[PDB]
Structure formats: structure tokens, C-alpha cells
Design a protein around this motif. Sequence first.
Motif, PDB file in Angstrom:
ATOM      1  N   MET A 169       0.726  -1.276  -0.067  1.00 26.52           N
ATOM      2  CA  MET A 169      -0.230   0.073  -0.053  1.00 26.52           C
ATOM      3  C   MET A 169       0.930   1.226  -0.060  1.00 26.52           C
ATOM      4  N   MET A 170       2.161   1.162   0.283  1.00 22.54           N
ATOM      5  CA  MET A 170       2.978   2.320   0.226  1.00 22.54           C
ATOM      6  C   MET A 170       4.032   2.272  -0.892  1.00 22.54           C
ATOM      7  N   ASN A 178       4.619  -0.247  -3.457  1.00 24.20           N
ATOM      8  CA  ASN A 178       3.965  -0.546  -4.585  1.00 24.20           C
ATOM      9  C   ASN A 178       3.474   0.652  -5.456  1.00 24.20           C
ATOM     10  N   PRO A 179       2.637   1.608  -4.771  1.00 22.99           N
ATOM     11  CA  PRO A 179       2.345   2.749  -5.500  1.00 22.99           C
ATOM     12  C   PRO A 179       3.358   3.233  -6.339  1.00 22.99           C
ATOM     13  N   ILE A 234       3.494   4.001 -10.291  1.00 23.39           N
ATOM     14  CA  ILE A 234       3.464   5.275 -10.854  1.00 23.39           C
ATOM     15  C   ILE A 234       4.756   5.375 -11.860  1.00 23.39           C
ATOM     16  N   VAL A 274      -0.891   9.088 -11.266  1.00 25.95           N
ATOM     17  CA  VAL A 274      -1.129   8.728  -9.890  1.00 25.95           C
ATOM     18  C   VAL A 274      -2.387   8.037  -9.774  1.00 25.95           C
ATOM     19  N   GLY A 280      -1.727   4.346 -10.599  1.00 22.60           N
ATOM     20  CA  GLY A 280      -0.869   3.698  -9.779  1.00 22.60           C
ATOM     21  C   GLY A 280      -1.449   3.350  -8.472  1.00 22.60           C
ATOM     22  N   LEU A 281      -2.373   3.941  -7.953  1.00 23.72           N
ATOM     23  CA  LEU A 281      -3.084   3.689  -6.642  1.00 23.72           C
ATOM     24  C   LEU A 281      -4.008   2.606  -7.069  1.00 23.72           C
ATOM     25  N   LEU A 282      -4.673   2.741  -8.114  1.00 24.99           N
ATOM     26  CA  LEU A 282      -5.867   1.900  -8.700  1.00 24.99           C
ATOM     27  C   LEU A 282      -5.308   0.469  -8.575  1.00 24.99           C
ATOM     28  N   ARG A 283      -4.292   0.281  -9.308  1.00 20.98           N
ATOM     29  CA  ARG A 283      -3.576  -1.292  -9.308  1.00 20.98           C
ATOM     30  C   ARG A 283      -3.689  -1.793  -7.814  1.00 20.98           C
ATOM     31  N   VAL A 284      -3.013  -1.048  -7.005  1.00 19.21           N
ATOM     32  CA  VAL A 284      -2.955  -1.343  -5.424  1.00 19.21           C
ATOM     33  C   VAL A 284      -4.393  -1.917  -5.034  1.00 19.21           C
ATOM     34  N   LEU A 285      -5.304  -0.922  -4.977  1.00 16.66           N
ATOM     35  CA  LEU A 285      -6.514  -1.319  -4.503  1.00 16.66           C
ATOM     36  C   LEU A 285      -7.322  -2.580  -5.225  1.00 16.66           C
TER      37      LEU A 285
END
Lengths: 334, 334
Positions: A144-145, A147-148, A152, A173, A176-181
Motif C-alpha cells: 500500500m505504500m 508499490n504505488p 507510478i 497517480v 498507480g493507486l488503482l492497481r494497488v486497490l
Amino acid sequence: PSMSITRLFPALLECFGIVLCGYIAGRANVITSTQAKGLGNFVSRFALPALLFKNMVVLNFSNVDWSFLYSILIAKASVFFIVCVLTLLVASPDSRFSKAGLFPIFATQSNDFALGYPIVEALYQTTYPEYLQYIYLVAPISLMMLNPIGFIFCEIQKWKDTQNASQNKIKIVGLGLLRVLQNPIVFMVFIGIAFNFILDRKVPVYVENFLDGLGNSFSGSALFYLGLTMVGKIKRLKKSAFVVLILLITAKLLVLPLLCREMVELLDKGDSVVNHTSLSNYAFLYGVFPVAPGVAIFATQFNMEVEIITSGMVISTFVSAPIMYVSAWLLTFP
Amino acid sequence: PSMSITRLFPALLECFGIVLCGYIAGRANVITSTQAKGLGNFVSRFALPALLFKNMVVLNFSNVDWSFLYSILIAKASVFFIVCVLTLLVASPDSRFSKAGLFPIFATQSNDFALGYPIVEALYQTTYPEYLQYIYLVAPISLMMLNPIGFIFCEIQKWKDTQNASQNKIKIVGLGLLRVLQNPIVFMVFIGIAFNFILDRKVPVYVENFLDGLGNSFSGSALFYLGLTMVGKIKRLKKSAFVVLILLITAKLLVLPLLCREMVELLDKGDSVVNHTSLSNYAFLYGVFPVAPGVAIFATQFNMEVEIITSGMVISTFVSAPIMYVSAWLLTFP
Ligand SMILES: CCCCCCCCCCCCCCCCCC(=O)OC[C@H](COP(=O)([O-])OCC(O)COP(=O)([O-])OC[C@@H](COC(=O)CCCCCCCCCCCCCCCCC)OC(=O)CCCCCCCCCCCCCCCCC)OC(=O)CCCCCCCCCCCCCCCCC
Ligand SMILES: CCCCCCCCCCCCCCCCCC(=O)OC[C@H](COP(=O)([O-])OCC(O)COP(=O)([O-])OC[C@@H](COC(=O)CCCCCCCCCCCCCCCCC)OC(=O)CCCCCCCCCCCCCCCCC)OC(=O)CCCCCCCCCCCCCCCCC
Ligand SMILES: CCCCCCCCCCCCCCCCCC(=O)OC[C@H](COP(=O)(O)OCCN)OC(=O)CCCCCCCCCCCCCCCCC
Ligand SMILES: CCCCCCCCCCCCCCCCCC(=O)OC[C@H](COP(=O)(O)OCCN)OC(=O)CCCCCCCCCCCCCCCCC
Ligand SMILES: CCCCCCCCCCCCCCCCCC(=O)OC[C@H](COP(=O)(O)OCCN)OC(=O)CCCCCCCCCCCCCCCCC
Ligand SMILES: CCCCCCCCCCCCCCCCCC(=O)OC[C@H](COP(=O)(O)OCCN)OC(=O)CCCCCCCCCCCCCCCCC
Ligand SMILES: CCCCCCCCCCCCCCCCCC(=O)OC[C@H](COP(=O)(O)OCCN)OC(=O)CCCCCCCCCCCCCCCCC
Ligand SMILES: CCCCCCCCCCCCCCCCCC(=O)OC[C@H](COP(=O)(O)OCCN)OC(=O)CCCCCCCCCCCCCCCCC
């Protein structure tokens, strides 16, 4: 000793024997490549989410030694930063952000559920059972920290692929966060925290048996799928690729454990010397864990380097077993 | 009560919820038909033999209540004989032997590992843990006694499909026994007995973790695979086909439990009324277990009735859950 050295060899035997069974099954065509997906889907989409939910709702967030989590998080972030800056300085201008995104991820996130959990379970059950929960706290937050940032960087590389005036900084951005979610681990951890608050840490007995049945099959199935995915992965390649593999695997398996240990020394303030030493030895073990296959999955998803990551993923598995045995033996010798 | 009725519903919830997860995964194409084979191979070829070996080496053959085992095999053989003679008298001359071979196997061989074991574990763990070993003794011996006769009947049917003067009776018996020997549940049981004598019921600690990691992934994965193979199986048949399905499923789920209870009433001398009553209730439960998917696999291998056995295998699963719930309630009300 705080870590059971006598139980370390049977646990390694179990893990890499299931890996060997999967590897031989794939080599002899007992389970083909297409059939491997069914075991992969079950273990990643059903077996892993159930275990994550059950270990997230039950977890006592109040009684967590955040010092270990902070120490390992900062160690991983520092390794990410060092690898990123070195790669950005030395990599070819054609592809720097791709390497600076995937190589720092390769060297920080490890096999914590499939293979990391059995080792911690064996060494840290009759002495320090609390050490098992950090597997389910370090890895989700690490994805969550850190990997974003890597995602990106990969999106930036894809943007250089589609050169245009439209930077799309918000979109870069956003992706990048969407793939983590989208990853099962992250959102199952979020739902597990939610239901830890709603259900007050008590999973209903009506779903206890179902969750245990779906989550007790992860370890063996995940190890077998790991062994099954290593069939035909290690291939000969250039000596520049060999030396970057050596550097990456070293950063993962020696540099990362040493850094984790030193930031544990700096951050963890424990009354007893013994528990602090044992926690630092655990932080050394966390990092000896081989590169997670999730890194290879990410490399396949972005399709930027599926040979540098996959080969180092398989090789680090064969290097982690001697190193973990040597390290703890060297760590239980004094 | 001897059996925990309050724990029965959570066990059914677990088993049929994993079955529902597999069914929905197959229906939504999460795991395809080809991908399902990889999970099928993992459970049948790796996960089940490891569990069978671990439960065969550990089992103390000296301390076994052979009365229950004898009663259950005599009940299954009586049902086999009754179904065989009735089918031979009433079925069409064309395929008497195929039906007289597979229908008696359908109505006696039950899902004892994937589905039967979790239920018995839920209801007979804190009271009668010895009841769990009979799952691993009844099913192999049933597969080694009744199944040879059914396979012999199917080989007779195949022989009349290849009508010739050379009836090769030795070959017919040879193929019937060979198929049983080739089954993992049989030859793994033989190897487990052999190593129970060689290792003196002590599995080495080196392989204990490996065996318990490869064998703890069976129940959930096997239930998921049972749900996954259930997709597209129940299809509308003829009225004669529906009535023979009803007769076969009744013989499996009401007649077989009743006969098992009768042979337990007769061939069992117990010091206590209570233990004999509980063990007869278990024998009633054994038979409420649905038709094993192995019977459908046998039908597919022989390719005579892949719509009569398979449909009744799926239907008996959805009838076993109400019956076992009702039967256990009716067996715990007094
Ligand atoms: C005792 C009896 C009870 C049991 C009965 C049966 C149990 C239920 C069975 C139902 C499912 C069975 C068959 C599965 C297929 C049917 C539909 C389906 O699920 O499709 C999945 C679908 C399958 O399609 P696929 O093409 O093969 O996979 C593509 C992937 O999705 C790759 O990703 P993508 O790129 O394609 O992205 C799409 C994906 C991406 O995902 C998303 O976008 C959704 C998540 C986004 C963020 C969510 C976070 C919310 C945060 C809330 C607050 C947190 C606080 C912190 C806030 C943050 C601040 C930092 O979204 C989807 O469309 C798929 C996910 C669906 C929604 C996920 C959320 C709920 C499902 C999780 C299970 C249940 C949870 C507990 C619920 C309790 C009450 C009902 O994808 C997945 O497999 C998703 C990953 C895993 C999710 C679970 C999948 C099966 C769930 C059952 C087993 C898990 C155990 C359950 C735990 C507890 C339950 C009690
Ligand atoms: C801690 C670290 C330690 C772990 C390290 C790694 C562990 C070892 C991994 C090795 C295997 C990994 C990958 C598998 C593929 C490689 C080759 C292979 O096995 O192919 C199988 C091969 C795969 O090919 P497939 O085309 O997919 O399957 C076709 C089927 O065979 C369909 O049948 P079919 O019509 O094609 O018939 C052919 C089949 C038919 O099978 C036969 O003809 C053989 C059995 C005939 C009768 C044997 C009974 C002997 C009785 C002795 C005395 C008993 C007293 C009573 C006497 C009777 C009087 C009533 O024969 C075969 O060629 C396949 C079976 C091979 C020999 C089976 C016997 C030994 C293997 C079982 C596992 C180990 C047992 C403990 C050994 C301990 C010391 C080494 O078939 C099977 O999967 C066979 C069924 C299951 C057998 C096990 C398979 C994998 C074993 C590993 C996991 C099981 C757990 C082990 C338990 C304890 C071990 C410590
Ligand atoms: C050198 C170090 C690693 C190996 C250590 C020692 C391994 C001993 C294996 C003994 C297993 C006995 C089972 C039967 C094996 C022989 C038959 C067979 O299936 O061959 C396996 C494979 C060759 O397969 P192939 O010949 O293509 O197809 C089979 C039909 N001929 O042959 C192989 O290629 C076997 C696999 C060798 C390399 C595996 C490397 C990755 C495996 C995971 C890590 C190591 C795990 C094993 C060591 C620790 C054990 C816990
Ligand atoms: C900035 C970049 C990213 C950095 C990420 C670092 C991890 C963040 C994880 C979420 C927040 C966790 C910390 C919240 C507690 C407040 C601050 C703190 O650390 O206090 C710890 C305190 C114990 O007292 P102290 O002596 O400070 O701790 C010593 C450690 N043994 O203990 C307490 O006060 C505990 C009280 C709260 C207990 C329930 C917490 C539930 C919510 C967190 C669940 C996980 C969410 C993860 C989100 C991470 C996002 C990146
Ligand atoms: C603040 C400024 C600090 C500056 C420090 C001084 C300079 C760096 C000194 C230390 C270097 C350590 C790492 C050495 C990497 C060597 C890589 C290599 O041999 O291949 C790189 C080469 C690219 O071309 P190259 O030969 O570098 O030509 C110059 C580029 N303009 O080949 C290629 O085409 C492949 C490119 C991929 C390179 C990947 C690099 C990965 C780095 C892994 C580092 C591991 C941990 C190192 C740190 C340990 C201590 C914390
Ligand atoms: C009527 C009695 C049996 C059912 C009992 C009640 C079931 C409630 C199910 C709730 C599950 C919630 C999860 C999401 C379901 C809705 C979305 C979905 O995936 O649909 C499932 C399936 C339709 O699939 P489809 O629409 O083709 O593809 C999905 C995308 N549209 O829809 C279906 O066909 C679902 C399956 C219905 C029939 C299943 C029969 C066999 C299942 C095993 C035995 C019953 C197990 C369930 C009951 C006990 C629970 C432990
Ligand atoms: C006719 C067709 C085939 C019929 C198959 C029926 C099942 C056969 C299974 C193998 C043999 C099991 C019986 C061997 C024991 C001798 C006879 C017997 O039943 O004696 C039981 C005796 C206890 O005394 P008793 O009062 O007679 O038992 C009451 C039951 N509670 O207890 C004893 O004497 C125990 C001493 C022996 C203990 C070790 C036995 C290990 C060998 C058997 C392993 C399983 C092999 C399965 C083979 C089946 C082949 C079809
Ligand atoms: C010593 C003499 C004793 C005499 C006893 C009394 C005689 C029996 C009286 C009842 C007969 C019931 C017959 C049930 C089947 C009805 C249909 C029929 O007989 O036709 C033969 C049928 C033809 O084939 P089919 O494919 O169905 O039709 C052609 C077009 N598709 O063939 C078939 O394919 C179906 C054949 C039926 C197969 C199943 C038979 C057994 C079912 C389980 C019974 C369980 C209960 C038995 C009693 C238990 C007591 C403890």
C-alpha cells in the motif's frame, strides 16, 4: 534459542518439498500450463482472501508493536529509494523508470504468505506467536505504500511509450493507486479491518468453519502453484543481466535483512535485550524471504521486463533456503 | 447428545459454501473447465494421497472396532447385491451389466473424504474421535471389495460390445482388479499400511510438516473442485430416467443408512447402550453421505451412463444436506 533452529529444517523441507512436487508435476506434464491457472485462481482469489479476512478481523490492532512495523517499513522504503536512485542514474535512458519502478519492488516485497508464513510459524510458535501477525501487517502496508510508487514509475514509462503533451499527472497517480486497490490483498485487508470494527474481532461461528476450510488450503496450494510456475523460467541470458541479477538478489537477501536489522536496532526500544535481539533476528529473516511471485505478475501485467524479474524470483528461492539456514544458525550460534 | 447438533449446521455451511464458491466461480467463468483439471489433479494426485498416507501410517490397526467396519461393508454388499439382482432382472437386455455394475456402486460408494470427513470431524471430535478413522478404513475397503465386482460387470458389458468366442474370463477379472489397484485410495492405503509396520506408526519429523502441508489443503480444495465440477451437470432427463434416479438416490440416502443401522444393531455387542446407539447413528449418517464424484469418474472412464450417475451425484449432494440435518435432529430429539 528464541528461534527453533531444530524446527527450521523440517519447515524448509515442507515448503521446498511442496515446491519440488509442483515443479516435477509441471515438468512431467502432470499439471499443464493451462491447468495451472485453476490452482492459481483458487489460491489467490479464494484461498488467500479468506485467510486474509480471517486474520484481519481477529487481529488485535491495539496490541501491536508498531516499532517493528515502522522499522521494517522504513528499511524497505530506504532500500526502494537507494535502488531507485541508483537505477535512475545508471540505467539506459530508453528504460529507466521501468527498472526504477520494478527493481525496487523486486528487492523489497517478498513471499510472506505462501513461504514466509510457514517458516515464521515453525520458528515462532511456542516462543513468540505475536510474530505471525506482522506477516499480515507488513506485507499489505508495504504493497500500500511502496508499490504505488513503483506502479507510478511504470505508468511514467508507459507514458514515454505514448509520447504526448498530455502529462496526465492525475491519471498517472490515479492508475498507480488503482492497481494497488485492485489487488486482492489490499482490499481484503481493508474489509478485514472494517469487519474487525463492526464484528468486534469475533467472526461468526456460522462462517468460522467456512473461512478455515477455504483458508487452510492456501499454504499447500500456494507452495504447489509456486513450484508449478517455476517450470521453464530460469533461462540463460547476458552477463550484464547476470550481474544486475546478482546485485538485485544481493540487495534483497543480504542488504535488505541487514538494513531491517539496523533500523530495528535504531527504532525498537525494548526493556529486555533478549526480545529486542530476537525481533532484530526476525527482521533479518524478513528479507531473507525470496522475491514474491507477485512481482513477476506485476512485470507480466506491465510487460516491461518479464525475464529479469522472473529469473531473479526463482533464483532467490534457491538462495533463500541456504541463507535462512545459514543466517539463523549463525544467529543461534552465539 | 453424543453428536453435536449445534455444530452440524456450521459444518454444512462450510462444506456447501465452499461448494457454492466453486459453483459460482465455474458459472462466472472465473475458473474454466480446462483450468479446473489443475485443481482436480492437485487434490486427487497430491493432496489426497498425502492425507491417506499420513492417516494410514499413524492409524493403530490393533485398536479398531472391527464390528462397525464389518457391519458397514456387509450393509453395502447387501445393497450392492439387491441393486444388482433387481437391475439384472428389470433392466433392458442391452445394458443390464453396465447398470448392474455402476448403479450398485452409485448406491454404496459415498463422498467420505471431501464431504464426509468434515461432518464427522464437526460432530465426532470432542466426543468420539475414533469415529474419524473409520472414514479412512470403510472407504478403501469398500473400494477394494464392491468396486471390483462393478468393474467386472462393466468389463463384461465391454466384452459384449466386442462379442467374440474368447470371453477371456481371466482378463475380465484382471482388468477389474487392476482398476482398483490403480486407484490412489487403494495403493496409497497399501503403502500406508506397509509404512505403518516399517516405521512403527511414527512418521519422521522431517516429512511430517511436508505431509501435513500437502494434506491440509485437500478438504477445502476438494470441496471447491466438487462445486466446480457441478457446473452444467444437472440436466432434464426422461420420466423413466427420473424415476430410476429417484429409486437410486433413495437407495443411497434412506435404504443404505437404514440397512447400515440394522447391521450395526445385529453385528455389534457393546457394554453400553449409549455407545452402540451413537455408533448406529453414525452408521445412519454414513449413507446419508452423497454419491462420491469418484463414481462419476468411473462412469466417465467406462462411458456407459455419464448422465444417470453424474446427475444423481449432484442431486444426492443437495438432498444429503436436508436429510443429514433432519436425521441428526430426529436422532437427537429422543
Ligand atoms: C458459510 C456460508 C457463506 C459462504 C457463501 C459463499 C461466499 C461468497 C461467494 C461469492 C464469490 C464466489 C465466486 C466468485 C465469483 C463471483 C463474483 C466475484 O467475487 O468475482 C471476483 C472476481 C473474479 O473475476 P476474475 O476475472 O477471475 O478476477 C479478476 C480480478 O478481480 C482482478 O481485478 P480486476 O482488475 O478485474 O478488478 C475488478 C475487481 C477489483 O476490486 C474492486 O474494485 C473492489 C474492491 C475495491 C476497494 C474496496 C475497499 C473498501 C474499503 C472499505 C473500508 C475500509 C477502510 C479503509 C479505507 C481505505 C483508506 C486507506 O472487482 C471486481 O469486480 C471483483 C471483486 C468484487 C468485489 C470485491 C469486494 C467484495 C468481495 C470480497 C469477498 C467478500 C468480502 C466480505 C463481504 C462481507 C459481506 C458480504 O475477481 C476476484 O476474484 C477479486 C479478487 C478476490 C475477491 C473475492 C473473490 C471471491 C470471494 C469469495 C471468497 C473470498 C472469501 C470471502 C471473505 C469473507 C466473506 C464472508
Ligand atoms: C520433506 C521432503 C520430501 C518430499 C519430496 C518430494 C516428494 C516426492 C515427489 C514425487 C512426485 C512429484 C510429482 C509427481 C509426478 C512424478 C511421477 C509420479 O509420481 O507420477 C504419478 C502419476 C502422474 O501421472 P498422471 O498421468 O497425471 O496420473 C495417472 C494416474 O497414475 C492414473 O493411473 P494409471 O492408470 O495411469 O496407472 C499408472 C500408475 C498406477 O500406479 C501403480 O501401478 C503403482 C501402485 C500399484 C500397487 C502398489 C501397492 C504396493 C503394495 C505393497 C505392500 C502392501 C501390503 C498389502 C498388499 C496387497 C494385498 C491386498 O502408476 C504410475 O506410473 C503412477 C504412480 C507411480 C508409483 C506409485 C507408488 C509410489 C508413489 C506414491 C507416493 C510415494 C509413496 C511413498 C514412498 C516412500 C518411499 C519412496 O500418477 C499419479 O499421480 C498416481 C496417483 C497418486 C500417486 C502419487 C503421485 C505424486 C506423489 C507425490 C505426492 C504424494 C504424497 C506422498 C506420500 C508419502 C511420500 C513420503
Ligand atoms: C539440485 C538442487 C535441487 C534438487 C535437489 C534434489 C532433488 C531430488 C528429487 C527427487 C524426487 C523423486 C521423484 C521422482 C523424480 C524422477 C522422475 C521425474 O519425474 O523427474 C523429475 C524431473 C524430470 O522430469 P522429466 O524427466 O521431464 O519427466 C518425468 C518423466 N521422465 O527431474 C527434475 O528436474 C527434478 C528437479 C530438480 C531441480 C529442482 C529445482 C527446483 C525445485 C525446488 C527447489 C528445490 C527443492 C528440492 C530440494 C529440497 C527438498 C525439500
Ligand atoms: C505516511 C506514509 C505511510 C506510513 C505507514 C505507517 C503505518 C500506518 C498504519 C496505520 C496507523 C498505525 C498507527 C496508529 C497508532 C498511532 C500512532 C502510533 O504509532 O502509536 C502507537 C501506539 C502505541 O504507543 P507507542 O509507544 O507510540 O508505540 C510503540 C510501538 N510498540 O498505539 C496506538 O496508539 C494504537 C491505537 C490505534 C489502534 C487501532 C489502529 C487501527 C487502524 C490502523 C489499521 C491499519 C491501517 C493501515 C493503513 C496504512 C496506510 C499506508
Ligand atoms: C547520490 C548519487 C550517488 C552516486 C554513487 C556513485 C555511482 C554508483 C556507485 C555504486 C554502484 C552500485 C550498483 C552498480 C550497478 C552496475 C550496473 C551494471 O553493471 O550495469 C549497468 C549498465 C548500464 O550502463 P553503465 O555501464 O552503468 O554505463 C553508465 C550509464 N550512463 O547495464 C545496463 O544496461 C543495465 C542497467 C540496469 C542497472 C540496474 C542497477 C541496479 C542497482 C542495484 C543496487 C543494489 C544495492 C546497492 C547499494 C548497496 C548499499 C545500500
Ligand atoms: C436454491 C438453493 C441453492 C442456492 C442457495 C442460495 C444461494 C445464494 C447465493 C449468494 C451468493 C452471493 C455471491 C454473488 C452471486 C450473484 C452473482 C453471481 O456470480 O452469480 C452466481 C450465479 C450466476 O452466475 P452468472 O450470472 O452466470 O455469472 C456471474 C455474473 N453474472 O448464480 C447462481 O446460479 C448461484 C447458485 C445457485 C444454485 C446453486 C446450487 C448448487 C450450489 C451448492 C449447494 C448449495 C449451496 C448454497 C446453500 C448453502 C450455503 C452454505
Ligand atoms: C471375505 C472378503 C473380505 C472381507 C474384508 C473384511 C475386512 C478385512 C480387513 C483386514 C483384516 C481385518 C481383521 C483382522 C483381525 C482378525 C479378525 C478379526 O476381526 O478380529 C478382530 C480382533 C478383535 O477381536 P474381536 O472381538 O474379534 O473384534 C471385535 C470388533 N470390535 O482384532 C484383531 O485380531 C486385530 C489383530 C490385527 C491387527 C492388525 C491388522 C492389520 C492388517 C489389516 C489392515 C487392513 C487390510 C485391508 C484388506 C482388506 C481386503 C479386502
Ligand atoms: C427374485 C425375484 C424378485 C422380484 C422382485 C420384484 C420385481 C421388481 C418390481 C419393481 C421394478 C421396478 C423397475 C424400475 C424401472 C422401471 C422401468 C423398467 O423396468 O424398464 C427397464 C428400463 C429400460 O431402460 P430405460 O433406459 O429406462 O428405458 C428405455 C428408454 N430410455 O431399465 C432401466 O434402465 C432401469 C432399470 C432399473 C435400475 C434400478 C433398479 C433398482 C433401483 C434401486 C431400488 C432400491 C430399493 C429396492 C428394495 C430394497 C429392499 C431392502
